[PDB]
């Protein structure tokens, strides 16, 4: 142990040890010697304009590296502005620490830790200078561990101000955790023997980077169908699976789905029944089989028949070994498959779509140009999130960020920020509707400042498109989803950012690839029809809730 | 999937489902349908007294057969009553599934589960008659899994009492995770290999049922040394292992200690830092692995070199398989064992009130192989655990984190009723008894063969002592005498009073031959308490 | 201010300010500093057998002498023992202020117990500063005294208590006017055109600080009273030949007929929770409240007039605004009237049958139980029993509103009053049920050579909860547990036993066990078979 003139020196050699190559927030009075004592860090300081996105940008670096983002801010409002985005990140399941001042502990004031317990899985406060690191050190553990989350850590001023006696804690990292059993194994490698319509559900932590080859081994070996609830989008996709039947969860015409409901033997990896209702897809007649690193969060349409809890790329990778030849497609699987193909023939159409302002499939088919496995896209929430989750099958991103279970609008720039610092070398294309963009567009000057590679582009409809045809197809009338226009180019130029507004669908290819082109931030603003939006709300479940 | 007329009829059958063989509690109105419906399971209803020892009943249950012991009670104070028993549960690691009433959901009032989440592992109110049967599953799932613990259910009146559309979801049971990774067994037995000083401290885990046998191929094939926390108590003993070096966290003179600072290794087998906090024992400078169900809960002095998580009879079997050699002990290993040779030789009285050595003595010689003690919290406690070593008993209910006065009584009632064939032995002070004394009418009710044991010195003399060591006077730690003999008797329970010192092993005796509930007076002499207190962690 | 050696000596030194006359508790290490402190001051330390009744003493305490009881107990268990009884305090405005033990605060780093209890107190609090202790203590009192009294809780680390402190004692505060003259006047004017007012009296009409001030309002309105059982002793039968009875049990009362009846009902330190607003009030009449503090409205209570102030300040300035007496309305005198007749018919014969009939019972207890003397009532069917004829028990003091319905208060509370009042008598009454959940206290009250009776009704049951199953059911469920022998049981703690073997030996047993001076117990074979018609009385049965 070292004698510490300062608890926020022990602090910082802590995050230090944890690996962290930033740190996100605005500072305050309570909690101003942490950002100093960074200045004597190899670990930047990242000032950004909302506490909110500070939460944002680290659950991005959370999800790429699998290591915990931090967020660092003072007390009071400074704590409450991150609520939103620690909650956001904790129903995505993406690791992030987040650090926050407080008033000193002779001074307690805002019960921080019971305000962030909700949206946490880890919210304490160090009443003690000698538990500081443990208590940091134990954040990261929870964030990252099991199903990872978001934790919120107090530090009182006068315990970070003042001197402190410990030691650094190694950061530890995931434990060496053993696969399901092989008698487990072996029986569900049997049953895979025996099935006539299988099919994986991949769930969240199947998308994690650890179990990446292990189930492209899975799926090479096996040929057995995929389908994925949303926090696993990005885990396989048409283009690198010929059996991939789409993500399920959002609409009602799902090859995945219809595989379920065929299905005689059903295995979910890493898959928790919050990432989509079981109520929906498990009839209860199939043979399932739950795979995850935690036991089945058990329900009563979710009640395994087999469950094999322990490291999944373990447990994958063993199921492999098992298995002796690929699956032969019964014929209702093929067609269901040759089905989806056709789906897909139908959607992407070929047509011209020179209309303005712009259909919905013009922007869509200009944005799968420019997004390539090179570039990474973030997508906010409004109508245009459900048009590119339509279309998830056709675009080829290094990773896309779209998963939303709390619909939080605003995510997308934040998102792409925290992605680009990640890999600043590759380009990020965050897209979001114009209401998402103004409750996080403060970060423009963030990403100037960074001089961040990244293109942003606003869907404009001039509205709260998504709430205003829920309205609708419930009350035949509009209620608080309609605003004022904006001229979006000159705003995204007052940052010194890039900006561009799109005047004529045939602008928007050659509008798209110069911003792309500009090396730093830009904004393109694209005028859009959404009449058409009833007819792909037809194809949600909701229709049917 | 089935329509039921009362949320009430699918609870008893999820219990079924569970494999509960009684429940504990007391009915109210609010919780009186769930009563009602178990009159037509085969659940035994078992009322107790006070709503305290419902939880205390239920821990043992759970702690002997791993399955959770099932507390019901009615909602307000039915419920408050519950919380030191629950949180007694949590604290040991004894899985308890405890369900209680609530107004109806219209009239919501008690914040149960606000109350009960600071000392549970799972608190929830089904607020939602549909999720009946999943919320009551999820909670024996929660208790039972990982390292066990306390779960409370809040049922609100109108929940239990109408019709619900539901199916008794089957008991899975703790899914069966597999044994630590190969690369990782292969890695903890080299650094048993490259290691001169080797110690295997276990905790709570290391001492369920289903770990036995591992355990004592890996002791009996590495030959290891072994210390233990108090809840890893009974995982192994002096007389089934020739290097045990004693339990830690009370005595500052035990072996393990010594030879814990000692070790460049340390191996700790379903241990949390909260069973024995680590700073009284890690330095650091040893090489640490831990070993459990459950990732590590590290602190400022628990950070392990290496994490091996899984299910622990299959690491500890396949970790034996990894180690070719017995153990030689380093010269100093020996030195350390050597002392507690001669410490243990040293351990190895007509006075009246009697002195508390004999009658730990007199004790041991009625508490056999096919007999269950438990013990509560008090002077006496500290006794008996100076000579854990010598006690043979079948199993020992003695760990309490809390201090919990009164667990003793209820304790042995849900030891016996899990094997009712055998004896069980409690023990416990005056105070003690008192505060679930209750309990004796529930004894003979069940006609529970219980023996218990009162170390009578009128006073609470665990907290007179700590008074007198630090301000030389008393205060609030005196009370009056009573006739034990007579209180016990009042109950339809068979009473003694040790008279004088002669009499103490033949009364034992006497009431240990009485098949059903007896209780034994044994006056006191505490004097020689000082003597013991300074062999205390100062 | 001043510097103190240990915390502990400040807290001592607090209680004293705040006039604390003994503490009820079980030490433990982390509190014994505080016990300690407590041998050199004048504040007697009295060691229950266990925490919650620590809690139920202090609540009688509190009750009578309207400053607040105190327990003190250790950390972990020691505070989760008083949640119960802490939450009893509350529910029925008992001020109690309870002390409880906990680790230092930096081994605070790993029992949340301020969590815990903040569900069931006014106040629940833990000293992070030394410097806080003596006004974290100050404020502990206040809450639970002032406005509408209840329970506190104060946690205190023992590093804080054990090391030194630097601080001086914080004076005890006290203390509204009366409410606004343009109030008491609007009210009057809506007297003046009542032709069928009631008063509805609620917990704080009952405070002592205005059984003057209610007397003459009574007394120059001669407005009928109906009254909660919180403020159950407010106003009696005999002292106003206008009072309705109390209201929250039976579905025969005058007092709700008259409240379904009123074109204006007055409540005098009243809240909903005492009595739910949906089984009175329809909302017809003219709704005036009158209290301490502010309305707690809600659907069926929103006050058309709200007063707030010093009641035995407003209601003597309302009487001086009386015109005249009213002259009740021809319905009102046929409710009274009919209550009347309810209480000759309800005094029905001759019931020598054993085990002893439940009327037996009650009628020799009014006997013994004299103007003096104070009675408890624990809950179970027997509550009911005596409910049914409060109006004929003339005690000094009656404590047996129990919104929670917890078992075990009876004993406790009893022992509590007596301290207040040693020189008095004291009756309490419970179930075996209830007995056996504190009964450990009978060792507390030979200790304390405690002038209490208690008397045990004897079914071998949970009978309360048994006729509710029989109702609902048909069958009984875990109510029913095997027999003891009571009056050794007593016996073996010191306390004088009886056992009541025949009915004509109940009055002769009931008179020795009065007689004794000191704790005596006396057990009561009760034959709980008539239930059902007295249960058949209760809301709960319309329901
Ligand atoms: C208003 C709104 C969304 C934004 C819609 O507008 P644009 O972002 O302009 O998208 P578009 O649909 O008009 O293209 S999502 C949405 C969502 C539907 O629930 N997410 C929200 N996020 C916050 C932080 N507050 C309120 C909502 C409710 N919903
Ligand atoms: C008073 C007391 C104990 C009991 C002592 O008396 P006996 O049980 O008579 O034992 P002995 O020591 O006199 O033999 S333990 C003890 C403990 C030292 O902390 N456990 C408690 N449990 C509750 C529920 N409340 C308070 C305490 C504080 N401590
Ligand atoms: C069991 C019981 C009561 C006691 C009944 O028995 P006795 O006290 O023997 O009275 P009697 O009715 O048999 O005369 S009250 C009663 C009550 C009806 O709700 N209060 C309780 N208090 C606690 C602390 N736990 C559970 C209950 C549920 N109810
Ligand atoms: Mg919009
Ligand atoms: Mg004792
Ligand atoms: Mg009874």
């Given at each position: 142990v070292r004698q510490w003139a300062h608890g926020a020196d022990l602090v910082v050699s802590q995050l230090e040890a944890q690996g962290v190559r930033q740190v996100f927030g605005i500072p305050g009075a309570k909690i101003d010697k942490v950002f100093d004592s960074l200045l004597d860090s190899s670990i930047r300081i990242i000032p950004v304009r909302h506490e909110a996105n500070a939460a944002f940008m680290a659950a991005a670096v959370g999800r790429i590296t699998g290591k915990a983002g931090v967020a660092l801010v003072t007390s009071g409002p400074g704590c409450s502005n991150l609520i939103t985005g620690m909650a956001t990140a904790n129903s995505e399941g993406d690791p992030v620490v987040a650090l926050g001042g407080a008033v000193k502990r002779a001074d307690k004031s805002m019960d921080t830790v019971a305000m962030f317990s909700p949206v946490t899985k880890y919210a304490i406060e160090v009443t003690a200078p000698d538990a500081l690191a443990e208590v940091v050190s134990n954040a990261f553990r929870a964030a990252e561990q099991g199903r990872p989350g978001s934790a919120f850590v107090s530090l009182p001023q006068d315990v970070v101000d003042g001197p402190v006696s410990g030691k650094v804690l190694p950061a530890s990292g995931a434990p060496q955790m053993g696969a399901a059993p092989d008698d487990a194994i072996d029986q569900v490698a049997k049953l895979i023997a025996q099935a006539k319509n299988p099919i994986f559900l991949l769930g969240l932590?199947?998308?994690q980077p650890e179990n990446s080859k292990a189930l492209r081994r899975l799926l090479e070996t096996s040929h057995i169908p995929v389908t994925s609830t949303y926090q696993a989008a990005?885990?396989?996709n048409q283009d690198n699976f010929s059996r991939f039947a789409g993500r399920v969860?959002?609409?009602?015409?799902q090859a995945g789905d219809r595989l379920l409901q065929l299905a005689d033997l059903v295995i979910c990896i890493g898959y928790s029944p919050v990432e989509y209702e079981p109520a929906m897809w498990n009839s209860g007649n199939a043979t399932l089989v739950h795979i995850d690193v935690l036991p089945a969060y058990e329900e009563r349409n979710y009640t395994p028949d087999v469950e094999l809890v322990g490291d999944i790329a373990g447990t994958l990778n063993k199921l492999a070994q098992n298995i002796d030849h690929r699956l032969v497609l019964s014929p209702q699987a093929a067609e269901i498959l040759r089905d989806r193909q056709h789906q897909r023939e139908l959607l992407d159409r070929?047509?011209?779509?020179?209309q303005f302002a712009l259909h919905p499939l013009r922007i869509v088919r200009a944005m799968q140009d420019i997004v390539n496995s090179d570039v990474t896209l973030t997508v906010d929430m409004g109508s245009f999130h459900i048009w590119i989750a339509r279309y998830l099958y056709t675009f080829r991103a290094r990773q896309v960020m779209i998963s939303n279970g709390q619909q939080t609008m605003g995510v997308a720039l934040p998102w792409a920020i925290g992605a680009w610092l990640v890999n600043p070398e590759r380009k990020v294309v965050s897209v979001s509707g114009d209401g998402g963009f103004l409750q996080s567009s403060m970060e423009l000057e963030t990403a100037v400042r960074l001089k961040a590679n990244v293109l942003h582009l606003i869907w404009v409809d001039n509205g709260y498109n998504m709430v205003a045809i829920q309205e609708e197809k419930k009350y035949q009338r509009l209620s608080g989803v309609e605003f004022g226009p904006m001229d979006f180019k000159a705003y995204a130029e007052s940052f010194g950012a890039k900006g561009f507004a799109v005047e004529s669908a045939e602008a928007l290819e050659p509008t798209l690839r110069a911003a792309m082109d500009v090396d730093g931030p830009a904004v393109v603003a694209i005028p859009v029809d959404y009449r058409d939006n009833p007819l792909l709300m037809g194809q949600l479940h909701l229709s049917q809730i």
């Open positions: 932590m199947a998308s990005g885990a396989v969860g959002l609409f009602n015409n070929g047509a011209q779509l020179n």
